[PDB]
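Thread: zinc ion complex, take 2
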Amino acid sequence: NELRCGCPDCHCKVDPERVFNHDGEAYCSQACAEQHPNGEPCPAPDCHCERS
Ligand SMILES: [Zn+2]
Ligand SMILES: [Zn+2]
Ligand SMILES: [Zn+2]
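Output below.
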């Protein structure tokens, strides 16, 4: 009943209509969804994820 980012390290604003689905989980952006492949940051407020 709550739509949040899949990244367990980052609390990002997820768009209910533009949500990136991955592994059955919801993501704010492709960045967190793809586990950040080549250093792609997410549109998070202050952001946290810098790993992987
Ligand atoms: Zn995110
Ligand atoms: Zn992330
Ligand atoms: Zn982030």
